[PDB]
Design a protein around this ligand. Structure first.
Ligand SMILES: [Mg+2]
Lengths: 782, 136, 121, 68, 63
């Protein structure tokens, strides 16, 4: 146990920005590190393209064009040869096809400025406002238990190996999560009530692309690629497969590069999804035959070769890592209320032992903090969430620290909040038919789109929090139609309500507002010394942890301990501050990888919960389900992923409010557009010709009360995220609608609004906060 | 068919005949979250318990009122025009089809009073959209 | 009628199936989705008797499920409905081969019994 | 000529008044419910003891869509 | 962006006869999701049909 890779499951998100470090992003390696950073730039900016061009123009280059300099006046247009020496000296071939780099200057007529101006227009056309790629760094750590990053002495070398696959077009339809019927004692992620009382039965599912028959021909439906880089050369290596595999389209599944320090950087693909024929439209949220996308996932291994002749293979499952690519994160600073890291944390717990869990205030604070910040991506949490409004009331009197009071005098205050949260036992707010017993919710239901003109049964119980759909959505009247924080998080919240929690005094002293205490907790993360475990947590804390229909990035197999070969609590974040803890976890891996005999396994014409049941026994012919081969983590997800994203928005009920939202922290549903930001960010005293969209004369002529009221009216205008690009609703008599959204998202995903923290320098008495989160696209800019 | 006509630019949203067939309305649900003053003698005030409403500063209380006042709802969403339910299609054409029965359920706008706007910026007479979906 | 190989070699797996009209919840309310009727006829009178139910069952629609008459020889004759199918809303279209919410039809099936009574008692 | 047989349907003798008139298996029906109904003593055996409506409830609704 | 459209090909033989071939039958829209659902008028589509002007110059041995 000498060397280990971290994180154990890296994440990289597609984007159409380039796979170069200055113009890309990095998956968090420290939780909460950039929550309030108002300088973030998640879309490629004009300034970054300029600065990329300036760096590419450092002499040698100016002097040497001061020699084409002379040969053009010994001539008094360019010619091909000197065109091809101007590029490749600039080395922009890797960013834009050489062809239009060449025609770039072919059309031309300070000579250096007609070069830059012409090329920056080509770069701008390709990349301006592009969705930057979010890339994963992987690190070799020395062990015994990670102590520090491998440091390469001169003579040493680390070689990385990556093998990835996409099996979505090979795999089964996604009807709902198969574990909803799987027999269990209960985990911290999923209560045994769901299966025991048949609250959301697992559905059978047929094969995608069912016209391709025989295992041998179905292998064509799997895209795969592999690559290697080492610390001796930093050249980037593409991971390109074919679809269908050996027509034929090239599929860039990702890009890898290693620096001279031995760190691996992994980029995901460009977000390109396509059908084999133009007329095959992706009209289903999940299962569209004839389609491929560039999502992928697979096996990360390494070999450490010392100057001493000693070689260390990092290849076994306890030491190696995994990588998965996913849709973009359109609000990276907005955390899902329950994350994939929370799924790992709860998968090792037994439901009936949750009464042995001990709770710190920092264990419940994440729920309240995330729910509060959902206001930037979801209307119901801005104007229809009585917990968020109460947090606001506490902040207004510097009274948030009372939530940290574990004594009886604060008990009613704590219970009042806890009592609004949905219980993941799924046994409240129900009436039992036939006490053959069905559990029928007596709160608000989410109807099927297949309507019956018979008056609904009036709800008698209030809708609990949060207001999001969940795994049981397909079943009107199931309590599992709606999302609950999972058993172990609900148990923390319960212990908090009861008073059975601990908190330190230094915490109470930074808890006058939620923001103040969030900054404190963020500092605790940044000063934690276990960078390996923090980095493993940071890779998963941005991902969704329910509901799974199928979800955004990953889905339900992740919430079972069976998928991990190791999953151990290690320590608190701080000695005295748990903050949900740090764990050491690793996925189960097939050590043959792409050459595994189980690479092309399936269950015949359908998969069913019976197959999952059989897979529990590690001796069975079905246990391969849990021993991942490249492509196994993402094959469950929707194909192409853009159809899932377009159907990951609101689910309207007959009652107008609150509007349920699926996965709004990563796929926002209601956002604050750039256009509104430009109408509230200035104070009346700004000395510009336009002030918050008004002439100087009008803005300053109005009373100060009226000026501030107009600021807050603008701040309050939230736009449907689906309207931030043309998804089929633009134009006279445009049809609009659900299905056009899915169809158009294939090309428009890269134009949807991206939410970014921005400053409000002088909010005065307007009530607008100093940090706002603003949605940037091209339609919503003004 | 007499509603918004969307352009590639998000704003302003063009609307056909909104004075008689409204496009963006102020629902009763929001009226019930800004009509009361902080001193109202009611166990619930603007959708909050008495205790929460009267615990907050007066500034933030008034801010909350204007934020509710500022939430305008698509008039086409004040009744089920084919967008309600899991995977519902919605869209222009289902609107046309469903309006034949749902026209009588769309929101009707009516003047209503605000007794004590205070410093909130809400006028003493507001125009409020009543429908059944529209309630709370 | 059916070989063992179909199930044993998983040649055409059975799929799970969800409820029709799934927005009608609780057993008690779903009873309204069922159309029923009954009637009696005897060999002493050949007047025909309709079998007429309601959908939804207690605007409601009358559903003629069939008609019965008996002749003086004691032969029962049973007539099916008129072939009338309808939705509760005209906009609800039956676009699926088998499962269309909001629709009812006049097909039916049920139990046929009789009593014989002879002169001697 | 393939023979003549005396056959009879299994019948619930209470007909419309049967306590089983409005029985189902919850949110879904699956082959496991059919397996459990094989045993005439079991709770799911009602599936084969016909009450009125039981023979045609499986068919397409409305029948004209299935014919088409 | 921008597609090559082969509208035809031409060749002349030793005796002065011109042969004209039409295109390959390639029709396409500028975006895969634009479908040609009208019998005549579909925006965003091109095809490789064409028509035009056929001229010649005869040049004899005597100039
Ligand atoms: Mg997010």
């Amino acid at each position: 146990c000498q060397y280990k890779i971290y994180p154990p499951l890296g994440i990289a998100r597609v984007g159409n920005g380039p796979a170069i470090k200055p113009l890309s992003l990095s998956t968090p390696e420290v939780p909460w590190a950039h929550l309030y950073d108002t300088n973030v730039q998640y879309l490629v900016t004009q300034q970054e393209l300029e600065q990329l061009l300036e760096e590419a123009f450092g002499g040698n280059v100016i002097n040497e064009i001061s020699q084409i300099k002379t040969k053009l006046d010994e001539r008094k247009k360019f010619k091909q040869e000197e065109i091809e020496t101007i590029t490749g000296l600039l080395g922009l071939s890797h960013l834009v096809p050489q062809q239009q780099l060449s025609r770039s200057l072919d059309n031309l007529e300070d000579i250096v400025q007609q070069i830059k101006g012409a090329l920056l227009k080509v770069l701008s056309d390709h990349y301006l406002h592009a969705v930057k790629k979010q890339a994963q760094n992987f690190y070799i750590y020395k062990c015994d238990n990670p102590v520090e990053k491998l440091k390469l002495t001169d003579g040493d070398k680390v070689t990385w190996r990556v093998e990835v696959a996409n099996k979505k077009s090979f795999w089964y339809d996604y009807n709902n999560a198969l574990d909803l019927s799987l027999h269990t004692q209960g985990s911290g992620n999923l209560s045994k009530n769901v299966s025991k009382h048949r609250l959301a039965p697992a559905m059978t599912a047929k094969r995608r692309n069912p016209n391709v028959i025989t295992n041998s021909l179905r292998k064509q439906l799997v895209i795969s690629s592999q690559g290697s880089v080492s610390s001796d050369n930093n050249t980037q290596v593409p991971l390109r497969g074919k679809f269908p595999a050996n027509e034929r389209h090239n599929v860039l599944q990702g890009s890898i590069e290693c620096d001279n320090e031995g760190v691996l950087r992994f980029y995901a693909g460009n977000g390109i999804s396509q059908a084999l024929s133009p007329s095959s439209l992706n009209t289903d949220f999940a299962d569209n035959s004839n389609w491929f996308d560039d999502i992928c996932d697979g096996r990360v291994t390494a070999v450490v070769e010392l100057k001493n002749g000693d070689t260390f293979e990092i290849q076994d499952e306890q030491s190696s890592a995994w990588v998965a690519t996913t849709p973009p994160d359109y609000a990276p600073q907005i955390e899902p209320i329950v994350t994939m890291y929370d799924m790992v944390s709860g998968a090792a717990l037994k439901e009936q032992d949750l009464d042995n869990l001990t709770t710190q205030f920092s264990d419940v604070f994440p729920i309240l903090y995330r729910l509060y910040r959902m206001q930037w991506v979801n209307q119901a949490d801005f104007t229809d969430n009585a917990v968020n409004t109460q947090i606001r009331e506490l902040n207004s009197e510097l009274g948030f620290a009372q939530l940290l009071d574990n004594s009886a005098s604060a008990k009613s205050l704590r219970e009042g909040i806890f009592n609004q949260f949905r219980n993941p036992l799924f046994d409240q707010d129900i009436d039992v038919d036939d006490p053959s017993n069905e559990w029928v919710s007596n709160s608000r239901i989410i109807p099927s789109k297949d309507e019956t003109n018979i008056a609904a049964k009036p709800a008698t119980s209030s809708l609990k929090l949060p207001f999001y759909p969940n795994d049981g959505i397909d079943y009107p009247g199931s309590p599992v139609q709606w999302f609950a924080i999972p058993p172990f998080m609900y148990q923390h919240l319960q212990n908090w309500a009861a008073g059975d929690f601990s908190v330190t005094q230094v915490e109470k002293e930074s808890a006058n507002t939620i923001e103040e205490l969030g900054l404190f907790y963020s500092e605790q993360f940044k000063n934690s010394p276990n960078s390996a475990l923090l980095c493993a947590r940071g890779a998963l804390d941005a991902l969704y942890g329910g509901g799974f229909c199928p979800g955004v990035e990953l889905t339900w197999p992740m919430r079972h301990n069976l998928i991990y070969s190791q999953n151990d609590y290690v320590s608190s974040v701080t000695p005295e501050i748990n903050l949900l803890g740090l764990r050491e976890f690793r996925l189960k891996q097939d050590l043959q990888g792409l050459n595994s005999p189980n690479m092309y396994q399936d269950f015949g014409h359908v998969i069913a919960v019976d197959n999952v049941t059989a897979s529990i026994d590690p001796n069975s012919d079905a246990a391969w389900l849990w021993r991942s081969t490249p492509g196994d983590l993402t094959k469950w997800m929707g194909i192409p992923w853009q159809s899932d994203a377009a159907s990951c928005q609101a689910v309207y009920t007959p009652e107008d409010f609150p509007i349920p939202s699926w996965w709004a922290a990563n796929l926002p549903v209601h956002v604050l557009p750039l256009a509104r930001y430009n109408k509230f960010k200035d104070s009346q005293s700004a000395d510009l010709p336009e002030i918050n969209g008004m002439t100087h004369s009008i803005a300053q002529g109005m009373s100060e009360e009226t000026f501030e009221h107009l600021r807050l009216e603008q701040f309050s205008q939230r736009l449907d995220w689906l309207h931030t690009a043309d998804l089929g609703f633009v134009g006279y008599h445009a049809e609009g609608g659900y299905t056009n959204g899915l169809i158009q998202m294939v090309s428009q995903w890269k134009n949807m609004a991206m939410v970014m923290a921005r400053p409000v320098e002088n909010p005065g008495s307007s009530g607008i906060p100093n940090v706002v989160y603003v949605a940037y696209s091209q339609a919503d800019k003004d």
